[PDB]
Amino acid sequence: ASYTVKLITPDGESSIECSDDTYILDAAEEAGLDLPYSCRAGACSTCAGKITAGSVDQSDQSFLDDDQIEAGYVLTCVAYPTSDCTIETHKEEDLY
Secondary structure, eight states: OOOOSEEESSSOEEEOOOSSSOOHHHHHHHHTSOOOOSOSSSSSSOOOSTTOOOSSOOSSOBSSSOSSSSOOSSOTTOBOOOSOOOEETTTTTTOO
16 A cells, blocks of 8 residues: 555545555545445445546455446445556535
């Protein structure tokens, strides 16, 4: 886990690059620092984030980023290791 790549949410600048399975809650800050404590696997929608995927992710294994492969989209809790992460939680789709 290195946590450094481009990440930003209501908590503006955020650095994440787990390079070791999208960290659970950490990459979650990417998901939208919503701390998805509902399902953790794939049943709720607390893992938002405009594509928090990152990299290495597309086998329904790891639990964070990767709606299916480089697209956190909605099923972020379905990722693999993750050479790096990236979430457009930044902007808030409203201003910042």
